[PDB]
Amino acid sequence: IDHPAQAPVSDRAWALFRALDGKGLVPDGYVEGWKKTFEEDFSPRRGAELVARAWTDPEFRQLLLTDGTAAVAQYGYLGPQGEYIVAVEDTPTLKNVIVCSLCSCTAWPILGLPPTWYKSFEYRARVVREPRKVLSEMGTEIASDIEIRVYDTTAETRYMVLPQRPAGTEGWSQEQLQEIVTKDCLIGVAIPQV
Amino acid sequence: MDGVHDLAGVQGFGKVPHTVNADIGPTFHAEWEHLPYSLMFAGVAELGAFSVDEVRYVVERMEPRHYMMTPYYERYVIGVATLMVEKGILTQDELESLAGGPFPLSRPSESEGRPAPVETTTFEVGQRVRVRDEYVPGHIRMPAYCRGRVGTISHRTTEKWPFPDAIGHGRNDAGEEPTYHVKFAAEELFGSDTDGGSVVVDLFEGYLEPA
Ligand SMILES: [Fe+3]
Ligand SMILES: [Zn+2]
């Protein structure tokens, strides 16, 4: 008559590493070095600097919007998973949001590694179809008359949102302006606030 | 591949686990989490054993319930481990001995992939294109919600990359193609069951045709 099992993930993860490193395959310090990069160099502070510069420099803003790779290359912030950059501009009538519905594709060197919520099945499934409801649940209310545009990162372009400069930031220096540009403003789910 | 990973448009999921600007804490919340991206780069860049596209596809080859129940960083531990074994660098046995337990891998590929189209069309910004209504069992960077649909090109890349459907299977006929940002009206993609305005998808030239 006709009538998955896994070791703990930490034991599987360390096993994979120990199998490679044993075989002379992982360079000395290689994994540790990447951990440092991911932690220290790939940062949303870089994206915030590019946004505070665009907000105060119209010519740099136009360069960022026409050739985003060239504008990031001026700072030397290009890198793995951030080699072809396109910045997308929010206007009074348009709110842009980025997702990788197929996995997690994110402009690492300038936004930092994707947060867990961005990689969730919930965000990947819902934001392409009901971005106004998803952003509302996360705490960002977008008025009915503003178009929402979702950029689904499906190939090699890596995106960063250029949000609107808030009213009330007149005479603010670039340092002051960088401070209100969060990781979530750069993904497109938060609006920068004063 | 029309797998469970192609989630955009799926209904029944609850809230995204985040309020805007909540403190996310460190990059890595568990001590092994940095290993899958590090070892993937060791394979891509140090060993030249597989491409990044092969890492996207092997995660899509995880059995569907196993994909759905596995957290993000663990899917890449299983993904990278499967490619080491498939590439003959490691064996499943030695992983299980070192893990002191079962290490199930992704399922074998059911497709050999497809070459880059030999003859294609260069499109221009502002032109109306259709996403080819085609079904591909191996790796493809076309989410199913835009298959057969109509949009307007807003950007053509100045750079060119190997065709995913060929390089995600390690084939030698991947060529290189630009991709196009194709803007779709939300109602073109989900009728009246959407509250958004437009969706832009970055599609390889080979996925597109005029009109
Ligand atoms: Fe992704
Ligand atoms: Zn029975």
Side-chain angles (χ1 to χ4, degrees), chain A residues 1-44 46-194, chain B residues 1-118 120-211:
Chain A
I1 294 192
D2 218 355
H3 306 265
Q6 316 184 103
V9 60
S10 183
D11 293 333
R12 279 184 282 130
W14 288 115
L16 172 57
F17 170 70
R18 294 198 266 241
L20 283 170
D21 187 39
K23 300 187 173 288
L25 265 14
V26 186
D28 309 85
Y30 193 81
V31 165
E32 296 71 44
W34 269 119
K35 184 180 168 74
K36 173 251 181 298
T37 309
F38 294 149
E39 273 165 10
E40 282 170 17
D41 301 330
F42 291 173
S43 182
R46 289 179 161 185
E49 191 178 20
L50 297 177
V51 172
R53 175 72 180 289
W55 279 351
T56 52
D57 183 345
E59 181 189 11
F60 182 75
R61 178 180 178 104
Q62 182 61 18
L63 183 55
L64 185 60
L65 298 171
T66 53
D67 187 341
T69 305
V72 177
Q74 166 181 153
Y75 286 81
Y77 294 164
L78 290 180
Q81 294 303 294
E83 281 190 62
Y84 189 89
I85 309 295
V86 171
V88 294
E89 180 215 13
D90 285 357
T91 73
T93 65
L94 170 73
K95 179 79 204 76
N96 295 280
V97 194
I98 301 145
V99 67
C100 179
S101 74
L102 295 168
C103 50
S104 68
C105 304
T106 286
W108 289 357
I110 54 179
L111 263 65
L113 296 194
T116 305
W117 63 263
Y118 178 91
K119 288 170 298 183
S120 78
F121 293 167
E122 289 73 9
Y123 187 65
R124 296 169 50 189
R126 300 184 50 216
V127 77
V128 177
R129 189 174 186 150
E130 46 184 25
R132 206 173 308 258
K133 188 174 185 288
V134 176
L135 269 46
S136 185
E137 294 176 349
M138 292 178 95
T140 298
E141 206 52 56
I142 303 304
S144 57
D145 61 311
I146 294 180
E147 183 183 336
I148 298 187
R149 179 164 297 156
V150 185
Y151 279 83
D152 192 356
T153 314
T154 48
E156 300 293 342
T157 309
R158 292 286 180 272
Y159 296 97
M160 62 157 274
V161 176
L162 179 63
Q164 294 269 266
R165 189 211 276 225
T169 55
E170 292 90 21
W172 279 33
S173 70
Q174 286 178 76
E175 165 64 45
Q176 292 168 272
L177 291 175
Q178 284 175 42
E179 294 189 355
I180 63 174
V181 188
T182 65
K183 192 185 177 81
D184 280 358
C185 292
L186 304 175
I187 298 166
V189 302
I191 282 167
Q193 262 154 246
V194 171
Chain B
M1 191 188 105
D2 289 331
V4 285
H5 70 274
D6 186 351
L7 292 164
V10 167
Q11 301 185 292
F13 279 108
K15 292 183 195 300
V16 175
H18 187 65
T19 288
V20 289
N21 294 322
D23 203 326
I24 246 63
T27 315
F28 298 119
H29 291 275
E31 64 188 327
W32 53 272
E33 291 183 332
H34 62 287
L35 258 30
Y37 286 174
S38 305
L39 296 171
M40 168 185 76
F41 286 125
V44 171
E46 301 306 294
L47 302 176
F50 41 79
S51 63
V52 171
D53 301 71
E54 285 187 272
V55 179
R56 295 197 178 89
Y57 181 44
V58 78
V59 166
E60 301 169 350
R61 289 193 273 121
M62 285 178 75
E63 193 279 332
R65 300 166 186 89
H66 194 195
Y67 181 99
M68 294 288 292
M69 72 167 266
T70 302
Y72 179 83
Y73 283 126
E74 182 178 341
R75 295 198 296 270
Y76 293 85
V77 172
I78 296 167
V80 177
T82 306
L83 288 166
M84 294 299 179
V85 172
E86 289 178 339
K87 294 312 172 80
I89 293 163
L90 296 179
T91 55
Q92 197 180 349
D93 295 348
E94 72 185 301
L95 286 176
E96 292 189 327
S97 294
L98 285 163
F103 199 136
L105 301 184
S106 288
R107 295 187 65 253
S109 180
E110 296 197 338
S111 169
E112 286 170 347
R114 67 207 293 227
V118 53
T120 15
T121 303
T122 296
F123 301 91
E124 307 307 330
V125 174
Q127 186 181 344
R128 270 172 90 252
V129 287
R130 167 174 249 99
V131 178
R132 260 96 102 106
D133 182 19
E134 62 196 353
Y135 289 82
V136 173
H139 187 54
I140 189 175
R141 293 297 298 172
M142 179 205 292
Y145 66 92
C146 70
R147 178 195 279 123
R149 294 311 189 179
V150 172
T152 307
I153 294 169
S154 70
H155 186 81
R156 181 191 333 116
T157 59
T158 57
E159 225 74 71
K160 295 182 182 282
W161 298 272
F163 197 51
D165 317 23
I167 191 68
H169 300 252
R171 297 175 68 91
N172 65 20
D173 49 22
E176 336 188 274
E177 296 186 346
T179 68
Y180 296 83
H181 299 181
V182 180
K183 183 180 95 153
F184 302 88
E187 69 267 349
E188 172 66 18
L189 303 177
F190 304 108
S192 52
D193 200 33
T194 182
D195 57 18
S198 47
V199 178
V200 178
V201 191
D202 188 13
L203 304 150
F204 275 79
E205 189 171 272
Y207 302 156
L208 311 170
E209 64 174 30

